[PDB]
């Protein structure tokens, strides 16, 4: 049941069917390239893409660095028939990896039946294909055949790791936003991937490896296939819809470019950045686009440029857009059918959900930026497999995502040089004469994401008219593996559209790519004058350059920032004195033991508080580590948190702007009792919604403006902890190298073993820090944000009570005999509050999942788990050690364990 049923080799000769030299649409003349049809409607061209866009045809690095965090340039890459053969095989393998998942199997099928609409006709009685949605397949006899296609995978342009969907346009039409769709060209490579940092999984995986992890390329391709899917169905969000950020403040990013489309594609929390009002706007926008396509089809009385029948064609599009067809043959769009389909394309196909299916380590948000680039080879099975990716079953690589740990799995990952320079794009932060200015550069992607307030729009202040008829929007349930299973089991895998004979296009197909909006390169090296040391300074002070000299820890941030041999520590002065002391060889091991103990002790410290509600634990050293808030003793931090709440953690206090809510106006029905009572019930139903809307809104403003600040603080604490380990190691390693060959020979000292120990201590520390910071973020929601919403809601309930009573009394004639019972319904309903339940609006907060993580944590620490299963005694751990059973071993028949 494979997706690609031929196994191609790049040197296979052209057959004119699935292997040919082909012409894609182009502005001017384009040189034919060798392509492979790996599936119906899907082609692969193993070539660096200089053809798609003749404008940028040169594979060299640009004059000015791109403003991304990671980029790589090699002009020679993919110039060889061998590399071409490997590209083809890698891409194919990734298609197969995706297809082998329930989610991927749907996506791939959706893409195939996602045939670009025939909108070519300027006469609406006729149905015609659009030219730029086709290619010309050159035959062995020199003739070309015109053939329509959905998807082409091509090699990357000058920037090897920049992957994107490209497609051709129309003189007037926007094919990606009008529901028509257009053939999608994806720049991709399976021969490289990104490195990233992950501290979150330590909760369930306390043994998580150190250093960078590699993105599973299958996730990356899937990401682009999702874009492709939107673009084919003409539902992509306009590229001028972007999430604006505040760049003016010293702590804010100089600039960041991210689009609603990308947010939609990532899924998870990123997609919850887009508020309900706008998510609605889109759904309606494309629904009407779909409705338009229905009316275009309905008035088409004949087909042109094919031997296929109008019947067959109209049916192709009925199956693509899920159209309802009455007894006459007229098409319309069922809001129910459409909602289901648009939901699958935008909420089911998401990077987040693919990760759930692949079971790989992946960035939880786009705000966890790629820190590195890596050369890989996934073609050999000993490296990467369709089922397991890099994390190979029944081996060390299967545990704790080791397959993706670049250091543990180092043979599969070769570190390349990031073309994006050191401090290429930064801000310059300077403290004032605390003796003259001490300035440091801060990497743009080390700064704070602070979304612009004009990102969150709401109709909350708009009133409504309640009506006997007015009816209720549904619950709008969250996406879950079982809902996906619902779509899956109802999905139709049978009917792929045929590859039809179409009238031959001209030898060259004329067209240009859709224009992308020009984005202002954001400012560089903005300078800032500050009165107080910042978080960025405190963290920078924890760094050192390698060298032969002995570094010392200091408790003075000032000293540390001023001298290359001085590294700041948030550990106690006792630790400082001890790690710095010149240590005799005979005492070296015991010294190290003590240092490892002290390290683990200080980083494991947790103060419990019984005083406050939502925050049970506090990690006190966060204060001196990041200079959170101010003053001196860590007892000040514990104290300030207990007193002021979570707000002391925030870099900026977010605006939460919740207006006076729009009141209800009820339409009166004279003498009609049943209508008058329904209107009353509807106003109460819509009131329950007003509460849910206000809660969704706040949750949305919190994910974007607050939980992102806390996620940064968290990432920085891991950076702090790693720096402390590096420093301590460097000092220990210096001490060892001071010894004589003879002294060393009597000290068995393994720096890799010591490193491994400190990395475990850092993990334990991150577990606590993670819990503390989660409680902190949530506490701020419960206590500092939600209440503004609840006040606006209670004022709304009060107004509605007065209105509803007035409506009842004015209508006492119609309502006679029922007046008392209705008063009670109104007074009782509106005197209650609807409690905010966080578990309702976001995935990670259910109570059970806390116990779930605890069970995982113990199971993932089991390196041998020996059970009797089926007929054999085996190892149920991910290492799957072999078991040899003697002939005289006896197993209890009643319980064979």
């Amino acid at each position, epitope marked *: 049941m494979p997706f690609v049923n031929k196994q191609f080799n790049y040197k296979d000769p052209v057959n004119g069917v699935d292997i040919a030299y082909i012409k894609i649409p182009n502005a001017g003349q384009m040189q034919p390239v060798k392509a492979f049809k790996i599936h119906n409607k899907i082609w692969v061209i193993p070539e660096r893409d200089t053809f798609t866009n003749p404008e940028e045809g040169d594979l060299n690095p640009p004059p000015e660095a791109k403003q991304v965090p990671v980029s790589y340039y090699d002009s020679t890459y993919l110039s060889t028939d061998n590399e071409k053969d490997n590209y083809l095989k890698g891409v194919t393998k990734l298609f197969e990896r995706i297809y082998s998942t329930d989610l991927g199997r749907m996506l791939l099928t959706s893409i195939v039946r996602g045939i670009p609409f025939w909108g070519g006709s300027t006469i609406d009685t006729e149905l015609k294909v659009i030219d730029t949605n086709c290619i010309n397949v*050159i035959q062995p006899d020199g*003739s070309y055949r015109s053939e329509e296609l959905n998807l082409v995978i091509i090699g990357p342009s000058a920037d090897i790791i920049q992957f994107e969907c490209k497609s051709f346009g129309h003189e007037v039409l926007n094919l990606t936003r009008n529901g028509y769709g257009s053939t999608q060209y994806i720049r991709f490579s399976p021969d490289f991937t990104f490195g990233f940092e992950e501290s979150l999984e330590v909760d369930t995986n306390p043994l998580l490896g150190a250093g960078k992890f590699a993105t599973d390329p299958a996730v990356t391709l899937a990401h682009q296939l999702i874009h492709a899917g939107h673009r084919l169905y003409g539902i992509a969000i306009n590229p001028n819809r972007v999430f604006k950020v505040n760049t003016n403040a010293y702590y804010e990013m100089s600039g960041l470019e991210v689009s609603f489309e990308e947010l939609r594609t990532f899924g998870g929390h990123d997609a919850k950045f887009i508020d309900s009002l706008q998510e609605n706007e889109f759904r309606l926008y494309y629904y009407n686009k779909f409705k338009d396509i229905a009316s275009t089809l309905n008035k088409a009385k004949s087909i042109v440029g094919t031997t296929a029948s109008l019947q067959y064609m109209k049916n192709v599009f009925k199956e693509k857009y899920l159209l309802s067809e009455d007894t006459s043959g007229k098409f319309s769009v069922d809001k129910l059918k459409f909602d289901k389909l648009y939901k699958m394309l935008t909420e089911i196909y998401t990077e987040d959900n693919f990760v759930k299916f692949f079971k790989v380590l992946n960035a939880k948000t786009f705000l966890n930026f790629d820190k590195a680039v890596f050369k890989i080879n996934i073609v050999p099975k000993v490296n990467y497999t369709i089922y397991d990716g890099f994390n190979l079953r029944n081996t060390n690589l299967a545990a704790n995502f080791n397959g993706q740990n670049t250091e543990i799995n180092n043979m599969n990952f070769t570190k390349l040089k990031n073309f994006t320079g050191l401090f290429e794009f930064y801000k310059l932060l300077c403290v004032r004469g605390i003796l003259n200015d001490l300035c440091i550069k801060v990497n743009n992607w080390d700064l704070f994401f602070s979304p612009s307030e004009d990102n969150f729009t709401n109709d909350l202040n708009k009133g409504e008219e309640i009506t006997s008829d007015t009816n209720i929007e549904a619950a709008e349930e969250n996406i879950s593996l079982d809902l996906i299973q619902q779509y899956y089991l109802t999905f139709n895998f049978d009917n792929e559209p045929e590859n039809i004979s179409i009238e031959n296009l001209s030898s*060259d197909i004329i067209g240009q790519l859709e224009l992308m909006p020009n984005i202002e390169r954001f400012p560089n090296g903005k300078k800032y004058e500050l009165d107080k040391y910042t978080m960025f300074h405190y963290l920078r002070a924890q760094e050192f350059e390698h060298g032969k000299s002995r570094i010392a820890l200091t408790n003075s941030v000032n000293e540390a920032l001023l001298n290359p041999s001085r590294v700041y520590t948030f550990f106690s002065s006792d630790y400082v004195k001890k790690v710095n002391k010149a240590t005799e060889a005979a005492m070296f091991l015991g010294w190290v033991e003590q240092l490892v103990y002290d390290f683990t002790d200080e980083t494991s410290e947790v103060s419990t508080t019984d005083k406050i509600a939502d925050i049970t634990i506090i990690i006190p050293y966060i204060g001196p580590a990041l200079n959170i808030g101010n003053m001196l003793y860590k007892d000040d931090f514990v104290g300030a948190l207990i007193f002021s709440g979570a707000v002391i953690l925030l870099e900026f206090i977010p605006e939460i702007a919740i207006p006076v809510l729009g009141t209800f106006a009820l339409v009166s029905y004279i003498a009609n009792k049943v209508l008058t009572v329904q209107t009353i019930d509807n106003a109460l139903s819509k009131r329950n919604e007003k509460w849910d809307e206000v809660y969704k809104y706040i949750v949305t403003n919190w994910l974007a403006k607050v939980n992102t600040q806390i996620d940064l603080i968290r990432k920085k604490m891991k950076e702090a902890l790693e720096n402390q380990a590096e420093a301590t190691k460097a000092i220990i390693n210096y001490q060892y190298n001071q010894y004589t060959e003879e002294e060393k020979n009597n000290i068995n000292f393994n720096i890799d073993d010591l490193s491994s120990k400190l990395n475990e201590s850092i993990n334990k520390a991150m577990i606590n820090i993670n819990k503390f910071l989660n409680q902190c973020s949530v506490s701020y929601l419960m206590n500092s944000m939600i209440p503004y919403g609840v006040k606006r809601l209670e004022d709304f309930d009060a107004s509605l009570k007065d209105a509803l009573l007035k409506y009842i009394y004015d209508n006492r004639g119609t309502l006679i005999g029922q007046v008392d019972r209705l008063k009670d319904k109104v007074n009782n309903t509106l005197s209650t509050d609807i409690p905010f339940q966080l578990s309702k609006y976001v995935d990670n907060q259910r109570l059970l999942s806390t116990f779930t993580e605890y069970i995982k944590n113990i199971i993932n620490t089991s390196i041998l788990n020996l059970r009797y299963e089926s007929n054999h005694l085996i190892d149920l751990s991910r290492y799957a050690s072999k078991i040899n059973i003697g002939s005289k071993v006896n197993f209890d028949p009643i319980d064979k364990n």
Partner: nanobody
Amino acid sequence: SQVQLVESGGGLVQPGGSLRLSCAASGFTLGSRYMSWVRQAPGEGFEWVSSIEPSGTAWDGDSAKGRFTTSRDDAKNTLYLQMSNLQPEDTGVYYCATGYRTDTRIPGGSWGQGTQVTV
């Protein structure tokens, strides 16, 4: 009738000034197809020489770029190849072939009988 391809050129000059090869086609309109030039040296495989599009555009391989210019005359239905600055490593039999970048004998393709070149 059928598809016929016939090359014409003598192929003798010592290194090395110039030569104009010719291919007369019948059965089809020359300008409606992708055509190629390819040579086979004594005791050796095929090498892609040139290619010409219906659009009249001409692409040339590593061999003889900045040397040969591929051309056509539609009324005379004949494919021309203009060679210059020839060397001894250019020796072999020159076939006018049916595809784009035709490197090989492909079922369905048409060829000439070959034209000798000794330099």
